[PDB]
Structure formats: C-alpha cells, structure tokens
Design a protein around this ligand. Sequence first.
Ligand SMILES: N[C@@H](CCC(=O)O)C(=O)O
Ligand SMILES: N[C@@H](CCC(=O)O)C(=O)O
Ligand SMILES: N[C@@H](CCC(=O)O)C(=O)O
Ligand SMILES: N[C@@H](CCC(=O)O)C(=O)O
Lengths: 400, 403, 400, 407
Amino acid sequence: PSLEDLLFYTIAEGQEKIPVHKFITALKSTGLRTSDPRLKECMDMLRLTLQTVMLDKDLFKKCVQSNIVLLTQAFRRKFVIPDFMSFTSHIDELYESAKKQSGGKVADYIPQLAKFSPDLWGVSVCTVDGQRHSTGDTKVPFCLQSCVKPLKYAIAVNDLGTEYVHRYVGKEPSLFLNEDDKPHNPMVNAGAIVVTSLIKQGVNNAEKFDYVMQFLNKMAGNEYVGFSNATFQSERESGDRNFAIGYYLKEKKCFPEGTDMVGILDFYFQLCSIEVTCESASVMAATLANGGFCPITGERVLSPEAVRNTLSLMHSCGMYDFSGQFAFHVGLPAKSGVAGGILLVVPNVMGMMCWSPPLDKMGNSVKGIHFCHDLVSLCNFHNYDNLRHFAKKLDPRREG
Amino acid sequence: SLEDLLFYTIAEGQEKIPVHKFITALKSTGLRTSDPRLKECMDMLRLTLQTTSDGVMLDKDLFKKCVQSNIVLLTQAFRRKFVIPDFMSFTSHIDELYESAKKQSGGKVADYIPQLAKFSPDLWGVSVCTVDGQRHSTGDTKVPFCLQSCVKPLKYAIAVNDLGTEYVHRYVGKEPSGLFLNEDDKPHNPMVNAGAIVVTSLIKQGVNNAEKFDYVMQFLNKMAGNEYVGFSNATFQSERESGDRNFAIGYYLKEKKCFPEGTDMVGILDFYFQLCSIEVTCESASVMAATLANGGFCPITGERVLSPEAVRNTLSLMHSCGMYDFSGQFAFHVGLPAKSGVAGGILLVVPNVMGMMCWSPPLDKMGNSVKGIHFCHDLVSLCNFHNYDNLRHFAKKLDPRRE
Amino acid sequence: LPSLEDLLFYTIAEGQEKIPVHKFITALKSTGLRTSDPRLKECMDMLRLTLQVMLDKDLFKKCVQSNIVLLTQAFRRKFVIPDFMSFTSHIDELYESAKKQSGGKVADYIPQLAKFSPDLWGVSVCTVDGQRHSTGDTKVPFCLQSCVKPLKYAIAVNDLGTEYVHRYVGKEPSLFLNEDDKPHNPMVNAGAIVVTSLIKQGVNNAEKFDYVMQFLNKMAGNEYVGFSNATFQSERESGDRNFAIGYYLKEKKCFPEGTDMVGILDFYFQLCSIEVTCESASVMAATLANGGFCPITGERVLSPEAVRNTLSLMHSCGMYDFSGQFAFHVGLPAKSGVAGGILLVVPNVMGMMCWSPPLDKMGNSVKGIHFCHDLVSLCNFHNYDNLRHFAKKLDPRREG
Amino acid sequence: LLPSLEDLLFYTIAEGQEKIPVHKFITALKSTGLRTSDPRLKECMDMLRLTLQTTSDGVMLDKDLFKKCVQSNIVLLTQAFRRKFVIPDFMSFTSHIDELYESAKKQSGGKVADYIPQLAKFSPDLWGVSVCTVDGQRHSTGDTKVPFCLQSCVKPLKYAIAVNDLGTEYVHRYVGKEPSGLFLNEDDKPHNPMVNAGAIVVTSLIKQGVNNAEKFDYVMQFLNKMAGNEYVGFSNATFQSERESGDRNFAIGYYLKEKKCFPEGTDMVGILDFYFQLCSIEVTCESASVMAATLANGGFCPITGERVLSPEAVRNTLSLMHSCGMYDFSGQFAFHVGLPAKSGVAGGILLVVPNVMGMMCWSPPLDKMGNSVKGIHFCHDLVSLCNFHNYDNLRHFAKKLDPRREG
Ligand SMILES: N[C@@H](CCC(=O)O)C(=O)O
Ligand SMILES: N[C@@H](CCC(=O)O)C(=O)O
Ligand SMILES: N[C@@H](CCC(=O)O)C(=O)O
Ligand SMILES: N[C@@H](CCC(=O)O)C(=O)O
C-alpha cells in the first residue's frame, strides 16, 4: 500500500533484494541522470549504504523515500516521453543524418569563431520532465552570440512586464526602425541592444553582468555557464555595426532616460560572449519549454508571461532571414547564432541545443537546420500538427 | 456490455430511464440531438416512441436497442472523455465573454458595397464547435453573411489538398509581407488579395467557372458538416462592379506571369469575386473552423475533408498573415490562427480544441471586427489557448480541457 | 538710306555686276537653311517665276525683298551657329564614331519594333534659326513611343496651366505613387496616362487624336507626322502593364471626374504609335529649344511656361533609370523612346533627333547615348558649362 | 590704333570738358557696380591716392593725369564704362533686388535652428542678400556683414575641391552623382555629396595623409581664394557644440566604416572632427556671394581674376546643387526656380546663376524642410521677375525681364 513499497515490488521483479546496479540501470532508462538535482537525497543515501550492494525492501525505502514522487513518475511511465530509449535512438539517427551535411562556412569575422572546427556537431535534449540525451560534441563550450537574445528578453519581461518592455521595442517581424520609432523586435541587433539597456538599471556593468549570469544559471539548472573575454574583446574591437546602431538609437531617443549608450554596448558584447555547452543550453531551452520552470531543479525561474512572449518572438523572428520559412516548414520557436548554436523549443515537450559551426548564407547552422527539418518530418512536434490525426509520423508522447 | 454499462450510469440505480432524462443528459455533453453521428440513435428513439407501450420509458433492453449503433460516441460523451469535459461551465464562460464584447460599440460597417453597408452594427454572434462536435452559440448565430476574405484559408486549403505544398508555393509565398510582390516575384502569401487571386487560379484547372465553383462549394459543404453554405449573387455583382483594385492586381499578375499556363485572368477574377460572395452563418462556419482544429476531419460527420499537410499549412498562414496589418500584434497577444473578413467575420481555430466564428459588422481602422478582436483578447486572457501558453503551468488561466 | 536688298546683292555679287542663280542657292545652303524652308517660300516662288539664269540688282531685289530680313541674318552670319559647315562636319564625325558602337538589343515586345534593322542610325539637327543638317537614316518613319510624353505634357500645360496639370501629376524623379497619391512625374508611364486624361476633355477619342496631331504638325513645322495602326493594335493587345496602371489609377481616383479610363488607355496607345522621321522630330525639339516658337515657320506653338516645365522634367526624368547619370554627364534635357528615339534639346541652340533601334539595358539607344556623351565632350553645350571659360571644348556659337 | 584706349575713355567721361573732377570719375565707376576697393582696380586707386597728394589742382585730372591713373587697369575700366559687363544697367537691377528683398522681409515664418545654442542665438529678423556678378559687380541689402556658419553650404565647396584635386572619376568611386529619392545606393556608395553621409565621404577624400590642422588650412586657403580674400573664418564655439551633439553623424560614420566606404587607411573618427570643423566655418553674405560667383564663372574669381577651381569641378558641383541642393525641396526647387543652390541650417542659401552672378541669402528662420523661408521666397520671386531660370529661353520669355539685355 506504501508508495515506496509499490515501487519496490515493481522494480524487485519478485526477488527479495534489488542489486544497486539493477536500480541504477532502470532509473537511467527513464532518461533521468543520476546527477539530477532532484535526486540528490536518494543518491546521497545510496552513497551512505555503499560505504558499509543488495538492497532489501527496508533499505531501499530508506534510500528512495525523499524522492519517491519523482521516481514513481519515472517508473510508472508518466514522463512526457514514456519510451525515452526509443526516442533517443531516433535522435541518434537524425544526428547522424545531419552529420553528413558538410556544407557551410564557419564565421570568420572574429578569430575566436573562425578557430572552431567544421566537424564539431552536437545535439542535446532536455525534456520538460528532465529526461536527458546527447550525441556528438555536447560538452565543448561555445558562445551564445544571438542565441542570448530570447533569454535576456525573458529576463527583462520577467522583471518589468510586457508593457514596460514593449514601450521600447516592438513585437512584430520586420538598422532602420518601425512605424513608432522602436526597433522592430528584440530578436534583431537594434532591439536586443534596447533590451540590453532595460536590464537592471542604476547599477554598474559588473553588477548587471553578475545578475544575468545568476539568472542564466537558474535556467540551466546550475550547469555550465561561462564567459569568453577573448570573444568579448574582439567583438568590441570590431563592432562598427553595433556602434552605428547605438549612436542611431541615441539620436532617435530609443533608450530609457539616463542611459550611457557606450556602456550598454559594452554590456551587450559581454552578453554575446557568454558560453554554454549543448547540454547546459538544452536545459535553458527546456525551461522555456516548461513554462518557466527549470525541469531539473524544479525552480520557477521565469514568469509565464516572460516565457510566452519569448516563444512568440522566437517563432516569427528567430532565425534571421529564414524566420518565415522556418516557421512555415519547422514550426517550432527557435533562435540561432553565429557560432552555429540553435536553441530550440518544443513547447510542453523539450528543449534542445544543436551546435555546428558552419553556416548557410542566411546565417544559420547548416546541420542544425537540416536536423530541425528532419525532426519535424519524423515527429508531430510542428505547431500546427494535430494531436489526434497526424498523418504518417510518430508521436513520442504516446507509448506506441 | 458497453451499452449495459452506459445504461446503469444513466439510470442511477433505477430500472427505467425516462427518455427526456437521457436527452437532457446527452445535451449537456454539448452534443446536439441533430448530430449526423447520433442519427441511428435518434431514429430508433423516434421509432420506439411510436411503438412503445409506456409513456416514455426505456428499460435496459430498450435503451440497448436505441443506443447500440452509436455506443462508442455516446460512451465518450458520457464518460467525459471529450476535449472539454465540463462543457456547461465552458459555455457559461463564453456567454460572459460575449456579453462583455457586446458593450464594445466601436467601429464602422463596411460600405464599399451596398450589401455590406446594410448590416446593423448591433449584430453580434459567436459559435463554438469542438473537435468532438460539442456545440454552443450566443447571439446572432443563424444569420447569413459573406465569408469575404475568410474564404482565403479555405480555398488555400483546397488547393494544397489537391495539388500539394510544392506546386502551390511555386506560385505564392509563405511569409507575412513587408500592390507589390516578394523578391521571387510571387505574391507574398495566400492571405493577401494578390496571393488569393493566384490561389484561385490554381484550383480545378481546365473546367469552366460553374464547375469550379460547384467543386469549391461541395468541399465547403463537407467542411461545414453539411450545414449552411450559400451564395450571394447580390454581393457578387457588387464586388465585380467595383473591384478596380483586384482588376489592377490581376493585370499586374498577368504582366509578371504569376499565373499557370493557359489561365484566363479575367475569368479567374470572376471566380474570385464569387468565392468572396459565399455565405455562411456563425454556426456553420464554426464547423469549418473545427475541421481545421481537428486535423482535417469534420468533427460532426467524422469525415476526412482536408489532408494534414493542407490543414497545417493553412494554420501557419492564418497565424502570421491572417488579420491584415494587425496580424503581428494578434499573433503576439492572442496566439491563435485566425482569418478576418470585411463583413465582420473572424474565423478562429484553437488547434486540438475547437473552431469558432465570430460576427459583428463594425470594423476598426485595420480591416477587423471590433467585438471579434475584443472577444479574442478576452478569450486568451481567460483560458490559456495561446499557442505558447504552457499546458502544465499557467499563471492563473483556466484550462477547459483539465476539469 | 541705301537699300537692304542692295546691300545683300553687292556682298553676294563680289563686284561682278550680276549673280547667277546657282551661286545664290549655294551661298544660301552654306548658311544651313534649306531652300524649302517655309519662311523662304515667297523668295523661292519668285525664283521659280523669273526662272522662266543671271540676276541683276533689280531682279534680285524682286526675288528677295519679301524675305530680306531672314536672308540678311543668314548671310551676315548672325545665326546661332555662324560657321554651320564646320559644325556639320563635326556632327558627321560624331555620327561616325557612334556608328561603330554596334552593342544593344532591339526591342521585341511587339513585332513592329522587332522588325527594324540594328544598323539604322540617323541624326538630325535643327537650329533655333532653322539651320538644318542630317546624317544617316533620317527620313525613315519610326514611332515616338515615350518620346511623345514631353510633347503631350507640353500640350496639357499650354492649354491648362501649370497649376491644373500638377494637381494630377507630380514634378519630381522617383505602378506606385508619390506621397500625395499623384504619379511621380509626366515622364513615367503612370503620369503619362494621367496627362493623357487631361487633354481636350469632353470630346470623343477621334477628336482628341486630331487635336494632338494638329499640335504636333505645328511643332514640327509641318514636316512628317504619321500614325502606325499596326503599332497601335499590338500595343493595345499586350499592354497588361498599362491596364494594371490604369485600374490602379482609377481605384486611387487619380483621373479628373468623368474620365473613361479604358478609353484613355486607348488614346494613350495611339499617342505612342505616332510616327516621325529624325528630320521632323528635330524640328519638334527645336520648338522646345526655341522657347515654343517653331524655328522654321516662326509660329508660336507652345507657351514659355509649357516649354520650361517640359525641359525641366526632361532634364531629371527623361532617360529612365539612366536619367540621373545623364543629367550629370550630358546635362541636356532629353527624352528616350523604346523604338530607339532620343529627342534632344540644347536650349537656345538646337533640337535633335537621334535614332537607332538597339537599346541598352536601361532601354535607351546605345548609339544615341554614345553620340550624346560625345557631343557634350566636344562642345560646351552641357547645362552647367560656362559660356566664358571652358577648357578644350569647342563652342560653335562663336566664330573662332 | 590712332587714338589710344586711355584717351578714348578720357573723352567719354570728360564730356568735352578739358578736365575730369575726381568725384565724377569715382561716381561713374561705382554705378557700374564695381567697388573702388576692387582688387583688380588697385593700381588705379593707388595712383589716385598718390596724385591726390602731389598736386596743385585739388581734385582735377587733365588728360595726361587721368591716363597715368588709369593706364594699368584700362581694359577693365573700358569694359565697365562702355557697358560691356554681364549686367550693363546694374543700377536698375539693384533697384529690382531691393524690391525683392523688401518683399521677402515681410515673410515672417519659420523657426530658428535650436539644436545647438550658437544657431539658436541668431535673431529671427536678420535678413541679408548679396550679389556678386561674374564681372565683380557687387550689391547688398540687409544684414550682409554679419557672420554665420556655412553649415551644409560648405558641402558643394568641399566637393569642388575634391574634384579639382582628384577628378570626377576618383571622387565618384566613393560617392554617387544622383538624388537619393540614412541609406546607401545600389553600389553601397552614399547617394551624392550633398547629403551628410556623402559629405563625410567627400571630407575623407581631401588632402589625405596629413593631419587635420593641415587639411583645415588647406581648405581655408581655397575658400579664401574663392571669396577673393574676403571674410572667411571660424566658429570654435559652433564646432564644439556640433561635436558634442552629432550622434546622427557618429551613427553615419560608424555605418560608413562598416560598409568600407572610405579610402584605405582612413581614421573615421578624425574624419568626423574635420567634417564638423568645416560646418563651423564662417562667412558673411558679401564674402559667400563672391564664392558663389566663382562657381558662376567657370571657376575664376570675378574680383581677383584668379583661377580657383577646374571647369570640371565647377560643372559637377553645379549639377549636384541643381538636383540635390535644398534637401527634400530639391525637386520642387529645381522645377520652380531652376537654379543651382545649397542651403544650410543657419539660414544660408548659396545661389548661382550660371554666367551671371552669385548670391548669398541669409535669414535664420527655417521652414520644415530646413530652408530659410525668406531665402525660398526671394528665390521664387527672383525667377518670376527674370529670365534666369534654367530652362527659361534667352530669346523668348513671355513677361520677364532680362538684366543681360541692354533693354
Ligand atoms: N555578435 C553579433 C551577433 C552574432 C550573432 O548574430 O549570433 C552582434 O552582436 O551583432
Ligand atoms: N472581396 C473583397 C474581400 C474583402 C476582405 O474581406 O478583406 C476584396 O477582394 O477586397
Ligand atoms: N509604349 C510603352 C513604352 C514605350 C517606350 O518606352 O518608349 C509603354 O507604355 O509601356
Ligand atoms: N550639422 C549638420 C549640418 C547642418 C546643415 O544641414 O546645414 C550636419 O552636419 O548634419
């Protein structure tokens, strides 16, 4: 009748004792990792009883009681994708298939970007329940670049609301400005720079940057977030483009009262030069997918308003000149950047990061784009893809 | 024993369910008794009402005979397995919203042709059709009016059905625009007039206008589950008198070679004005919308009408280009695929949930119905049908699916 | 006191007591006048009479007295170019030099245009004093096409004033419309179509076309003007472009009240189909050069307001997309046509028609353009050349 | 050959009198429209000063005395006196200028530029007009001796210098020759030197490889010559204010730098500095009119006789003033006035009538196109009065007056 007992019997298979490796394996095949923040108590307990292999009903109950709800959900098959092994097999195929696509040029406008190999290709999945999978180069760091644009937009809306933010920037797809003399949307450079000015006003750059990093940490569930000073230096050295825009926004009175624009550009470049991995960035995406809750910590990180707005803008303006085409064919909110990241959200299902340095003339990762098309081909995930009556296509949220 | 199970749950330990009781129970699911799918059942009840010894009473074997043919659907309806289980509560909310948008007396009625100018400003209707056929209506929901540009996604859908994404999008774009053309010399997308005219040319090539029109009308009949779909000659004549704009567009498309080989552009414009002049009611156009929300299956007839590719493409374009120059703002704030029309229609799809139509004739400075727009804003604020609302977490929205 | 006829006799005589006719005819020709000049008709009629060979003072005086003023001007070297023989030698060189330029393509959108040989090339000059010269294929009818646009604009302004005309059409360089929903300028097709609707309102098409033809006669001092029905028929069959514009103009209410726009388009295609030689069109251009007086009849044809406005719009909008470049390097008011016409005006000096059928990709005659640039290199005709100081440039107005 | 040029002139002035009184000669000379202080006349005026000291007959020149005074300058003096200048009846023409000036005076519209304090300081009521003929005949009315900044009035001048020194072909690699119709044209060149973006590129072309101080001096000397050594100067105060608040131009500079619009090895921020210095150069109506008259005279300066700009330079500059010279009123202006003209935000309009004269019009209130209201009114009136329009006919002008015509 006890929860721990019920779970014990199901895992036990009628034996009297569960070998520790039998439970770990079973757990792993739900897609959870053993380093999941929410499973810390259980793993700490296992570490304890290991200092003294076989777990009886009472010893097991002692290890798992703190995390029984989550563990049951996993073992009952209540996660958003129940057959995660099958799903990861499919992800592996899509990865392999995109790997073959050798087209594209690596971004060479600064050394740091130009230094990355064309053969680097990673894909990471984090489910809204925290199920995690990776193939390829998922642990290498690289800079978010423009991929940071939704995240800081999220932050601004989180902190200030829709109304205040949208006083300063628009919300529709397109250096030039909209009808009302706002930049068109936070997904372009002009709008991003305006969004940059909004965040934590009245404290210095160092402080502001620390705030954004803490927030990024929560979104990633305390996985890898870093900073590239080198990238930062080269960006500031060579951003005549963004200097143009700043002076223009200044002239046109685009910033909030008492903005030091040159200082905001400096912040803006530091923001571009933040580093993630596939793995960490997928958690961030999963946060967006999960409604502002981090799927691995369980923390509320972003308001429902922040997340909805962000996904809306990722939809229509997220992939530079390919936005509209991407919305039509792929139908997922996403954002890319010049180091080859695409950050992809499949609302209520998962967050994804894809990384490959060579880009197409639109500015997007070749393999990343190829991968996203393939995903949507295979899976009902398109925004306007019916839940009942897909045509020929898989639904991973259905047992099979 | 499926029929037996349902009998015990309806009876409430009694031994004879009185007919009116079953009907009332059935209704509050949201189905209407006139549902195509429920026909065998209703026919049997009528039969036994005649032949019966009792006033009106059905014992187990009698109930079984009436419901057996339609048991699957009746079990879903009664086990609360439909998309919106607490339909009564949902319709109460719809009614509050309707009332609240009623007060919004703003706008002007289109007057560029007499037929449009005739409509009273105080006409206001809303109708709902679920992907399970649960129906509801408030206001002026049985009044015919013309689809106008509401017909644009419907005919686009037909074209993609018959021809495929690839063929169709040779001749027309798939992105919200910047009357002119895109960098590839295609009209920007089917939702604008230039691209609608091109889509019109794609449909049922090589047969006369009369045949083409019948083809489209039949298709519309199926989408609407054979509810009202009509023609307005009066509207049509007036459209063709005064479409110098569309004549402009046609001649420009002809110059730039945007039509298929052997298109007669003037005849195509005629077909176009006819398409615009098609009449619906709120009630029947909600079923049309629900076909689009139900993946191409008509939720009342259960009939496959449009391919999944067609339906998906049409919703993508209603998302981004459906509300003229308000499109962007609508996509952001409402987040629902929708098409507006100059008569005051707003065709609304909430994918996997329901279809609606909304009618009031005063329009704002953009082409769109004031009460419709206000209703849609209100609906989203209430209920978490926003495309990028979370299913599992939402602020204090309401989830009609959940209970 | 001593007669004017007497004076001219002795100058031509050269102390010989009698002048033969042929000598006077040759003398007259070398001023650049033609013996068929309208203003010299009395004198030619007299010669025809008495020529039923040698002319004494008294006989001469009888022949020339009626036209003594114009003859004394010619002979006493008071015409705009005085060494006209030298000038024509230079025209001939320029004509040859532009000859060799065989580039370009002949327009082919209607059969009638596509027929013309690429090797046709004519250049006609008419001076404001009526001095004429020609090289090449100068007596071959072709259609003015858009070369008719300045002419009919001239007619409209003549008849209606600047203020009326410009209510309907704009006055600046660029189916779309200016800020105020007027077409940009009478030189583009949209504006030309509006200018067409302005002329002789309240009468049927046949009457309007007769009126325009009469006006064109006067402008050309009764030299060749004709109509190509064939051109007209083809134009009308295939002007989907102009049907587009007309419907658009109708929608935007660009025409005066009670215009039948379809009939206006009809007239518009008739105007485009009007036929000139180089010779006749050069006179037309000289009318514009000479302030609205026809230099060969001395008749006032257009008002100074008509002519000024027309030259202004020629300057800036006369050569399609090439216009700007043309104004800058050539600096002469000119209108080009799809048939290879370039109508060229050198204010206060002369009119020209250049014709060759191959066009460049701006739609302008290759050789016409090559010849126009050459003319300006040679002579201080450019609009912003200085009359007093100019570098190596020749100036035919001066005697040398 | 028999009677001598100086002698002939003597009889024409003297009028059968054996002697010409000085004041008579001076008065006659002035009414040609020359100023006694004309550079070309300096020998004559020096001699008169001499003889006015060295003589018995206080004020009276005989034949021999007159000859000694005028002999050095006799050509230009015969031109003046024998009515061979471009406007022969200058005194009638100035009467006409006066009436137009008075009429423009009455126009009280406009707003004074306030984007910097130095501009905003100028009184609305200031209004001047200066005329300089291509023969050096001068006239002024109104506030002609007050200084003000050229602002964008400097743009054709520095363009002229660039083309003089480098040629059409070099210059137009970096800049367009057509009205725009901020943005770049099809070829990623600014549209034309008359817009700010194009002006900033023109600025970079001039005296490359030297420091700003040298460059500035080089432009100044050039301006001095165009003005016949009349006032040109500088407002450091204006310059400081420009550089503090030119976010617009910094925006442009950064954009031009990104799109590689400058010559190889350009320091763009230093270029901007030099640009603002140019905008801050000062003239008066009188001095700037001589500048304009240079341009109306195929690049010689009418008062010095000195060749200043190449013919090519001047022509190109007049072409661009025609089509792009009056911001967004350029097309209307070209149609209605038909003169090459440049305006500036201080209220200047620099106006050229080819082959006839140069003008400078100044009043500080601007209309919402940014041009001096009184300037614009004056220019329209000038055209309506006389046959100066571009495409006005020299022989047939319906009712209009022609200054060149002996009348
Ligand atoms: N660092 C670039 C953005 C690179 C990107 O688009 O990813 C910028 O700030 O403009
Ligand atoms: N038939 C109308 C449709 C108007 C509308 O619904 O926007 C047209 O083409 O203008
Ligand atoms: N008739 C042609 C233009 C002829 C020309 O360009 O000269 C048209 O209206 O399009
Ligand atoms: N200071 C302004 C120029 C003023 C003017 O237009 O005259 C600028 O450099 O843009």
